[PDB]
């Protein structure tokens, strides 16, 4: 579920790309969030995997 | 104190010196119980076992 909240806020701040922008510490903050994710589920897979050990 | 016992009282050549004992109602013998084979949830961090 924290993966799929970190990637919804990474589309977020990429949208908030277009408009808003000269900020150039949201594309960072999108790239944060997408890496942020990717973490997220690797746990979530290891945790799952390791659940169904009994 | 009692005129017959109903129960698995086992037919032993001891017994039957003292009581009566009638054919068997029940053929048996003794066995093992054990706890059964379960797992064994490796530990988080037993790669440092």
């Given at each position: 579920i924290l993966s799929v909240i970190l990637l919804f806020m990474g589309g977020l701040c990429i949208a908030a790309s277009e408009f808003?922008?000269?900020?150039?510490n949201i594309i960072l903050s999108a790239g944060i969030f997408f890496v942020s994710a990717g973490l997220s589920n690797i746990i979530g897979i290891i945790v799952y995997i390791s659940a169904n050990a009994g | 104190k009692a005129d017959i016992a109903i129960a698995p009282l086992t037919i032993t050549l001891v017994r039957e010196e003292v009581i009566d004992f009638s054919k068997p109602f029940m053929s048996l013998g003794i066995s093992i119980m054990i706890k059964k084979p379960q797992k064994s949830k490796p530990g988080v961090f037993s790669f440092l076992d």
């Open positions: 808003y922008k000269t900020r150039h | -």
